[PDB]
Design a binder for this molecule. Structure first.
Ligand code: CL
Lengths: 7, 144
């Protein structure tokens, strides 16, 4: 969170 | 944040990333979130879109027409576009307003509708599903 996938 | 996402909602995000990868895209746009929601298959979002006649095929056709594919797929994590970030931010608020501390697939779909301006919204309108019609369908399926 909040850049890509579950990040 | 993602600690609040249900398992299905987390899977929607992972599926969105891999949809982007398989289209040789290097961002996750709102249209990949839409594809992820359909791919996930089980949740309220998938059921709402299926019940409106919005299929993986129709969405893929429109994404190819609008965005097309890249030449070479990327590896590693594929970053969210600014609009996809906004959709995921809004999904938190949609879930709280519907009385939930968890973010389920329906709240991602509702946040996508709420953002209302990205590729996914263009696709949905092109497929005959106005955003207010999608929102009403989600509410109706939750009312059961
Ligand atoms: Cl869910």
């Amino acid at each position: 969170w909040l850049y890509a996938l579950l990040l | 944040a993602f600690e609040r996402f249900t398992d299905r909602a987390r899977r929607v995000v992972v599926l969105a990333q891999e949809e982007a990868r398989m289209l040789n895209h290097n961002y996750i746009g709102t249209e990949h979130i839409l594809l992820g929601l359909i791919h996930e298959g089980e949740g309220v979002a998938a059921k709402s879109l299926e019940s409106l006649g919005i299929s993986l095929e129709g969405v893929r056709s429109q994404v190819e027409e609008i965005i097309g594919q890249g030449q070479q797929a990327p590896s590693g994590h594929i970053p969210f576009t600014p609009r996809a970030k906004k959709v995921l931010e809004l999904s938190l608020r949609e879930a709280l307003q519907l009385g939930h501390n968890y973010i389920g697939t329906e709240h991602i779909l509702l946040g996508l509708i709420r953002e209302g301006e990205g590729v996914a919204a263009q696709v949905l309108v092109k497929l005959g599903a106005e955003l207010t019609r999608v929102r009403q369908q989600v509410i109706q399926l939750l009312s059961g």
